[PDB]
Amino acid sequence: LTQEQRLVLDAVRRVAREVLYPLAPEYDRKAEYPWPQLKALAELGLLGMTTPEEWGGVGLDSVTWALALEELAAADPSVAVIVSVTSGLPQYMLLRFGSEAQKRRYLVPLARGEWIGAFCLTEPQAGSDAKSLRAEARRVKGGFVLNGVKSWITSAGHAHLYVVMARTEKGISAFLVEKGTPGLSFGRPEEKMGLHAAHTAEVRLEEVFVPEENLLGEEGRGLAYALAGLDSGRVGVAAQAVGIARGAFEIAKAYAEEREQFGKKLKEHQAIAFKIADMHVKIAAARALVLEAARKKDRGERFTLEASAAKLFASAAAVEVTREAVQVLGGYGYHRDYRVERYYRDAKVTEIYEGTSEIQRLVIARELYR
Amino acid sequence: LTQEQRLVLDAVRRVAREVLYPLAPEYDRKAEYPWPQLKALAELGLLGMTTPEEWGGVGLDSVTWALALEELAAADPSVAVIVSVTSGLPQYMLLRFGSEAQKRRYLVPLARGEWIGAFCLTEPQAGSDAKSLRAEARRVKGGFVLNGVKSWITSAGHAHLYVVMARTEKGISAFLVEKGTPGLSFGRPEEKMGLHAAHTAEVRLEEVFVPEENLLGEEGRGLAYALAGLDSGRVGVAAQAVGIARGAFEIAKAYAEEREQFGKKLKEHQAIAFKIADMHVKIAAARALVLEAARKKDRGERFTLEASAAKLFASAAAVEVTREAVQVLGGYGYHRDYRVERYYRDAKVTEIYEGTSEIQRLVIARELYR
Numbered sequence: 001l002t003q004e005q006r007l008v009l010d011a012v013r014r015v016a017r018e019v020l021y022p023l024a025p026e027y028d029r030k031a032e033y034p035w036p037q038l039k040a041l042a043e044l045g046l047l048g049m050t051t052p053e054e055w056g057g058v059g060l061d062s063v064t065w066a067l068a069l070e071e072l073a074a075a076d077p078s079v080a081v082i083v084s085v086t087s088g089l090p091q092y093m094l095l096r097f098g099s100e101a102q103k104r105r106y107l108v109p110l111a112r113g114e115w116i117g118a119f120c121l122t123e124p125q126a127g128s129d130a131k132s133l134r135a136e137a138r139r140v141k142g143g144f145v146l147n148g149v150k151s152w153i154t155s156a157g158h159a160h161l162y163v164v165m166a167r168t169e170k171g172i173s174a175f176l177v178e179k180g181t182p183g184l185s186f187g188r189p190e191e192k193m194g195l196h197a198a199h200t201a202e203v204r205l206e207e208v209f210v211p212e213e214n215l216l217g218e219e220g221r222g223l224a225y226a227l228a229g230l231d232s233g234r235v236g237v238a239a240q241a242v243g244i245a246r247g248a249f250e251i252a253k254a255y256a257e258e259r260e261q262f263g264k265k266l267k268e269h270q271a272i273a274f275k276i277a278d279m280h281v282k283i284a285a286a287r288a289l290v291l292e293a294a295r296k297k298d299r300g301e302r303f304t305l306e307a308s309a310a311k312l313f314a315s316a317a318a319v320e321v322t323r324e325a326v327q328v329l330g331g332y333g334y335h336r337d338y339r340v341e342r343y344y345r346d347a348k349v350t351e352i353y354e355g356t357s358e359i360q361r362l363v364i365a366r367e368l369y370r
Numbered sequence: 371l372t373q374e375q376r377l378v379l380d381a382v383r384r385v386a387r388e389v390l391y392p393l394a395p396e397y398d399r400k401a402e403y404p405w406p407q408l409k410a411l412a413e414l415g416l417l418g419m420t421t422p423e424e425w426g427g428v429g430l431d432s433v434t435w436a437l438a439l440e441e442l443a444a445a446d447p448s449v450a451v452i453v454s455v456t457s458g459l460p461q462y463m464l465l466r467f468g469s470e471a472q473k474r475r476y477l478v479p480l481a482r483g484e485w486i487g488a489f490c491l492t493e494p495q496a497g498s499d500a501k502s503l504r505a506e507a508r509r510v511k512g513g514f515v516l517n518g519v520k521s522w523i524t525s526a527g528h529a530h531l532y533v534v535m536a537r538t539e540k541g542i543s544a545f546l547v548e549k550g551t552p553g554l555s556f557g558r559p560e561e562k563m564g565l566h567a568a569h570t571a572e573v574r575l576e577e578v579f580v581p582e583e584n585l586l587g588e589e590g591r592g593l594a595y596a597l598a599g600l601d602s603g604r605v606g607v608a609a610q611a612v613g614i615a616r617g618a619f620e621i622a623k624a625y626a627e628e629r630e631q632f633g634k635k636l637k638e639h640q641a642i643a644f645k646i647a648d649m650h651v652k653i654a655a656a657r658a659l660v661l662e663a664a665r666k667k668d669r670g671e672r673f674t675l676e677a678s679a680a681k682l683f684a685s686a687a688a689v690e691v692t693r694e695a696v697q698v699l700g701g702y703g704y705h706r707d708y709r710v711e712r713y714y715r716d717a718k719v720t721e722i723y724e725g726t727s728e729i730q731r732l733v734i735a736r737e738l739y740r
């Protein structure tokens with residue numbers, strides 16, 4: 001890493017350790033939306049890592065961006081997912097497909113972290129098959145009228161701007177809906193296994209009016225925009241999966257060096273030393289795939305294949321590492337006060353969102369036979 | 371890859387694809403030593419990739435080196451092993467610890483590929499635990515007299531130069547022994563599961579006299595010299611493991627495209643498509659780990675951890691990849707004519723030589739707590 005890249009990570013590391021880490025436990029057991037953490041990050045411009053400085057962001061390179069997400073996830077996976085989403089598709093789509101006026105009033109406040117954004121694609125009946133969503137959008141003189149139900153929306157009810165994907169006569173399109181808008185509604189946050197602080201709920205739209213200017217890019221070419229940003233999002237989630245593995249790993253490594261049983265520190269029993277070594281290898285391999293993808297992105301080359309590979313491997317690595325991390329601490333690994341149990345719960349979901357492991361495999365195979 | 375790197379690799383592909391690949395089958399079947407392939411590689415200076423030009427080598431960087439070994443192993447694992455060994459410790463040790471006369475006399479002929487080299491350390495009772503070797507080296511009149519047996523020696527009886535690790539009153543030392551020296555004999559090549567063309571056999575030293583000039587480095591410092599090239603050797607084996615995996619993967623991927631069963635091409639069956647994707651992911655992860663260690667090596671940094679991690683991972687990926695590669699071709703995967711079976715047999719040994727997987731984990735663990 002260059003001095004510059006390490007300077008950035010020095011800042012990310014500081015906020016992660018000083019703000020995210022100490023607050024993580026309370027926010028997880030209370031399933032409380034992380035406003036203090038986000039604000040702490042916005043002030044550092046970290047909610048705009050994927051956006052150029054001339055749009056309110058800090059425009060980092062993909063490698064530094066990936067390592068930052070890992071650092072944030074290692075401290076609080078919940079805070080990291082929200083970050084990756086608000087500076088994810090919402091800021092990706094506005095930047096590459098939005099108008100100068102849209103970029104001026106929407107991108108800027110997102111990149112600067114004044115607003116939290118959200119992406120709405122998933123529907124109760126359509127998940128992996130986005131290409132078949134049923135949210136409607138009819139042309140009304142003045143704009144459009146949206147009707148539908150979006151599910152599993154990260155930051156729902158908290159985000160100021162929502163990028164809603166709906167269908168029109170011409171096809172699937174992207175819309176920009178602000179909070180407060182008449183008709184827009186939010187269900188109660190879903191109770192889940194992990195990512196407790198990262199609220200996810202339904203975004204309900206009943207006869208919501210959207211101005212002609214709130215339409216994002218070409219009508220009917222929205223799904224294409226979304227998939228365009230998915231490659232990046234996956235590298236981002238892959239990065240997070242590595243962070244989740246690293247966070248649990250560090251606790252296990254330290255523990256095996258302090259804890260003693262049968263007259264030796266745990267690391268002195270081959271079984272345990274081998275678990276610590278396997279964990280490391282999985283993490284190193286996972287990060288290697290993440291950075292390779294990030295570098296390819298920066299070279300302006302197609303990186304769909306490398307993105308799914310990294311997402312797929314890292315999420316599996318995260319689950320596999322955390323399982324052993326808990327194991328190393330014995331009973332204590334099951335205790336909330338030791339954090340590894342929290343990492344174990346969060347790890348599993350990385351195999352589901354941002355494209356399930358099954359879907360990542362379809363994409364990979366498709367790419368291999370292109 | 372830079373222009374120069376592509377040129378070297380383009381040259382590696384040609385020889386691997388026009389010489390190694392075509393001959394591999396009959397040499398494996400007949401368990402025949404690969405002289406023609408070795409000669410074709412020597413002419414290209416490929417038997418000295420790891421040595422500077424001032425000493426007869428082509429002084430390639432670790433990345434081009436790693437990628438080249440991968441390429442050679444993909445076409446013929448047996449030839450790749452001999453290459454990595456003849457240009458492995460024998461040349462590593464001479465370069466770094468040899469005297470001007472020794473490098474001029476032995477290193478140059480090895481680097482140019484005029485001679486094949488061999489490293490003798492392993493004994494019937496000492497394998498993973500090198501320190502407990504029994505080879506004896508007594509200080510005689512104006513020289514040394516060696517006695518002992520070395521087993522599992524790659525290129526035994528074909529190599530012209532043998533680096534024998536024996537012990538003297540001061541400790542384990544490195545000795546250069548040329549073929550033809552009285553007292554030095556060889557056993558018949560061991561009957562192994564794979565790497566058929568890569569003959570390995572016993573190296574007997576019965577009252578073998580070695581002149582003072584043929585001692586490498588400081589007496590009793592030999593074991594240190596050896597473990598010094600070990601990090602590089604493991605990177606090389608890791609690269610070969612990747613090659614073995616690539617070889618099998620390519621055949622299976624293609625087959626899944628041509629073969630049909632139940633009305634579709636195999637790739638159209640999800641289970642098969644997913645196997646192909648999974649093979650790709652572990653191969654990519656393996657390669658990434660290998661190149662990460664290669665670069666660190668080139669930066670002159672300690673890469674003992676990265677070396678063991680790469681070798682441990684790639685070796686396992688080769689076994690996992692080949693297992694499924696055989697599975698994709700069904701009954702034909704078990705047939706000699708389809709080559710995958712050969713990659714499956716060769717892959718397993720990569721988890722054993724150059725430090726078993728159990729050993730790699732000790733190193734990784736030791737390194738993580740250093």
Ligand SMILES: Cc1cc2nc3c(=O)[nH]c(=O)nc-3n(C[C@H](O)[C@H](O)[C@H](O)COP(=O)(O)OP(=O)(O)OC[C@H]3O[C@@H](n4cnc5c(N)ncnc54)[C@H](O)[C@@H]3O)c2cc1C
Nearest residue numbers: 119120121122126127128152153154200353354356358359
């Ligand atoms: C914590 C979390 C946060 C999320 N945040 C958002 C968000 O902010 N915005 C948003 O729009 N969505 C979000 N989602 C939803 C997520 O994108 C969807 O869950 C996912 O895209 C599809 O999963 P599903 O629930 O529809 O399951 P399904 O698509 O019904 O799949 C169920 C099972 O079938 C498998 N499967 C499906 N199709 C195939 C196939 N063709 N071949 C083989 N197997 C198949 C799936 O892999 C899975 O194992 C989030 C989800 C979670 C858990």
Ligand SMILES: Cc1cc2nc3c(=O)[nH]c(=O)nc-3n(C[C@H](O)[C@H](O)[C@H](O)COP(=O)(O)OP(=O)(O)OC[C@H]3O[C@@H](n4cnc5c(N)ncnc54)[C@H](O)[C@@H]3O)c2cc1C
Nearest residue numbers: 489490491492496497498522523524570723724726728729
């Ligand atoms: C094809 C091939 C080529 C080879 N070429 C050479 C060569 O050119 N030169 C040379 O000197 N040698 C060579 N060898 C030998 C090889 O280096 C040794 O086999 C290896 O270093 C040690 O294995 P071993 O056979 O002595 O088994 P052992 O050392 O007896 O080990 C047996 C089992 O016990 C495990 N084990 C050992 N110690 C521990 C421990 N402390 N904790 C946990 N588990 C342990 C091992 O991992 C293995 O699972 C070659 C071997 C093969 C198969």
